[PDB]
Amino acid sequence: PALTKSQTDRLEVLLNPKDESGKPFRELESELLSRRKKDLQQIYAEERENYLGKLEREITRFFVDRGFLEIKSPILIPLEYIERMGIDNDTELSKQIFRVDKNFCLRPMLAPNLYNYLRKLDRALPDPIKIFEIGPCYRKESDGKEHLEEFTMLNFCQMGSGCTRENLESIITDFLNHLGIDFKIVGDGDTLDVMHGDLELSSAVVGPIPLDREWGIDKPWIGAGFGLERLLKVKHDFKNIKRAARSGSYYNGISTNL
Amino acid sequence: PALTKSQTDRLEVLLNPKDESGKPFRELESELLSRRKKDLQQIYAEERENYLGKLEREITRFFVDRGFLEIKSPILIPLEYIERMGIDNDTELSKQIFRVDKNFCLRPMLAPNLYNYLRKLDRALPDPIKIFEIGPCYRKESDGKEHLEEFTMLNFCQMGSGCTRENLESIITDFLNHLGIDFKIVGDGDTLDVMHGDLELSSAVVGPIPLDREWGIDKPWIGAGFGLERLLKVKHDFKNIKRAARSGSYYNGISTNL
Ligand SMILES: Nc1ncnc2c1ncn2[C@@H]1O[C@H](COP(=O)(O)OP(=O)(O)NP(=O)(O)O)[C@@H](O)[C@H]1O
Ligand SMILES: Nc1ncnc2c1ncn2[C@@H]1O[C@H](COP(=O)(O)OP(=O)(O)NP(=O)(O)O)[C@@H](O)[C@H]1O
Ligand SMILES: [Mg+2]
Ligand SMILES: [Mg+2]
Ligand SMILES: [Mg+2]
Ligand SMILES: [Mg+2]
Numbered sequence: 149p150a151l152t153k154s155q156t157d158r159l160e161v162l163l164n165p166k167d168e169s170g171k172p173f174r175e176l177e178s179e180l181l182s183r184r185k186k187d188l189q190q191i192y193a194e195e196r197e198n199y200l201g202k203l204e205r206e207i208t209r210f211f212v213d214r215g216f217l218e219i220k221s222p223i224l225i226p227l228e229y230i231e232r233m234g235i236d237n238d239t240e241l242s243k244q245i246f247r248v249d250k251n252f253c254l255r256p257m258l259a260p261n262l263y264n265y266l267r268k269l270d271r272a273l274p275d276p277i278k279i280f281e282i283g284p285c286y287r288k289e290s291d292g293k294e295h296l297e298e299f300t301m302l303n304f305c306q307m308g309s310g311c312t313r314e315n316l317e318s319i320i321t322d323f324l325n326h327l328g329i330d331f332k333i334v335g336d337g338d339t340l341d342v343m344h345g346d347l348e349l350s351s352a353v354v355g356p357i358p359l360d361r362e363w364g365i366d367k368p369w370i371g372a373g374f375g376l377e378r379l380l381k382v383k384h385d386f387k388n389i390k391r392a393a394r395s396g397s398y399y400n401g402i403s404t405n406l
Numbered sequence: 407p408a409l410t411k412s413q414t415d416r417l418e419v420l421l422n423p424k425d426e427s428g429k430p431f432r433e434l435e436s437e438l439l440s441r442r443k444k445d446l447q448q449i450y451a452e453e454r455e456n457y458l459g460k461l462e463r464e465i466t467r468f469f470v471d472r473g474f475l476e477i478k479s480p481i482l483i484p485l486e487y488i489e490r491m492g493i494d495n496d497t498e499l500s501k502q503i504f505r506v507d508k509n510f511c512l513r514p515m516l517a518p519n520l521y522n523y524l525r526k527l528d529r530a531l532p533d534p535i536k537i538f539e540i541g542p543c544y545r546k547e548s549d550g551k552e553h554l555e556e557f558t559m560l561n562f563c564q565m566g567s568g569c570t571r572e573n574l575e576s577i578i579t580d581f582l583n584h585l586g587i588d589f590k591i592v593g594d595g596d597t598l599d600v601m602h603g604d605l606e607l608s609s610a611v612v613g614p615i616p617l618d619r620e621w622g623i624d625k626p627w628i629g630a631g632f633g634l635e636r637l638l639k640v641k642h643d644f645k646n647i648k649r650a651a652r653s654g655s656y657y658n659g660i661s662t663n664l
Pocket of ligand 2: 515545547552553554555556557558559606607608609631632633634635636
């Protein structure tokens with residue numbers, strides 16, 4: 149009569165956060181199976197959009213409408229960028245890098261390429277320079293509950309005039325209130341964290357910082373990186389971040405093993 | 407007086423396909439520099455959208471509106487998928503794979519994960535099953551004029567009813583006429599190529615094919631893969647595909663080394 153742990157795990161895979169003892173496993177499972185197939189049928193009949201693609205489109209519109217230039221830069225980057233970011237073997241991230249070939253890696257962050265664009269664009273664009281990128285990033289991780297090895301970052305930045313902590317907090321606040329995500333900014337160049345409960349949604353920086361010089365910067369700047377799968381996890385109340393990932397196993401949080 | 411080859415290369419970097427002897431290099435270069443900065447200024451002032459992100463959004467809308475479910479699946483995939491696609495050391499692609507770790511690689515195509523979704527979705531969705539994905543793909547290449555090692559694929563597919571060569575050609579035709587790209591379908595399970603002059607835009611398949619069985623398929627299907635950077639190259643008349651790539655060196659076809 150009591151469900152086994154295995155049976156409970158199985159049912160939890162099929163449980164949407166929205167769902168609301170007695171019946172056997174086969175019955176509980178059968179109920180959940182037809183609910184999930186119905187959810188997928190409804191997606192297919194109406195909207196047809198993937199959550200992660202749709203979030204990316206919504207965030208792009210948010211930033212484009214606020215004067216930020218949309219960037220798409222390489223995902224496979226020179227290994228030299230990692231060192232140049234100050235990620236020496238004395239840091240946590242140095243062990244988390246997926247290397248490709250002798251000279252390349254999968255980007256673990258958007259910073260290097262956005263530094264390069266800020267430098268280059270300063271030669272062409274009026275002050276302030278406002279840019280952002282959304283795209284895949286990669287880190288080896290132990291955790292599986294709040295972490296993915298393949299994830300998606302948003303990074304926005306501004307360089308020149310108006311690069312204040314007040315302006316930075318205001319962008320973050322307008323951003324998260326637009327998405328409808330509850331948050332807290334925590335802090336004391338300047339570095340702050342945007343938290344949902346104990347989940348880190350973003351880390352943000354008020355520059356200048358000494359690293360800028362390695363990238364040829366020399367102007368004040370503000371910026372923040374957010375993980376889109378964490379935003380989805382929070383917004384859709386997914387218990388595990390795997391429901392928000394690029395995946396063959398979940399589609400918009402619905403199990404595909406039906 | 408005659409421009410050197412180096413000087414000509416430099417000026418060609420700054421030449422947009424749209425542009426229209428006597429003056430020295432410094433003058434020619436200076437003219438082109440202020441034109442390119444002006445192009446970037448105009449992008450920044452008005453639209454702010456990256457070509458590759460914008461093309462992806464336009465193609466997504468095209469397919470979503472035609473009843474295709476939007477998929478986002480992993481870019482880092484099991485190495486076993488490559489073998490399972492029938493890419494043995496007797497093929498060209500086997501040498502083109504970027505391996506990561508012992509067990510992984512960067513996807514060189516979208517097929518494996520879309521096979522997996524067609525199988526899984528058949529258990530939930532009504533006939534026909536219509537899906538697509540747009541995203542990064544990776545192959546080691548010698549060529550640099552029509553090829554990128556980091557590129558972006560669109561793959562759409564349909565499985566079940568209506569999986570005919572006529573329907574396949576019609577989707578392709580409506581698709582490319584929508585984008586405004588000139589093409590020719592060339593062919594004779596069934597395999598056709600969509601060509602722009604001598605440039606291959608797409609390869610398309612009318613299934614079933616014997617490979618399907620390895621992926622648990624067993625239904626008729628149609629599908630095609632297009633490279634988005636080739637579509638941009640053709641549409642914007644870029645002479646080299648690097649102008650259409652994720653890049654620190656070009657933005658919407660405009661040199662960032664100004
Ligand atoms: N492995 C991951 N999976 C999903 N999101 C991630 C992952 N790593 C980082 N992020 C997101 O990227 C944002 C900025 O990156 P960063 O500040 O470098 O992360 P971090 O400091 O390693 N955070 P954490 O590992 O939770 O302590 C983070 O706040 C997360 O939202
Ligand atoms: N390296 C690349 N760079 C840009 N686009 C590519 C690249 N490789 C493949 N594609 C695109 O993906 C589409 C389908 O992939 P596929 O049919 O496997 O390419 P292919 O047969 O290797 N074509 P090619 O190498 O030009 O002879 C191709 O028609 C191209 O539009
Ligand atoms: Mg971390
Ligand atoms: Mg952090
Ligand atoms: Mg090839
Ligand atoms: Mg081909």
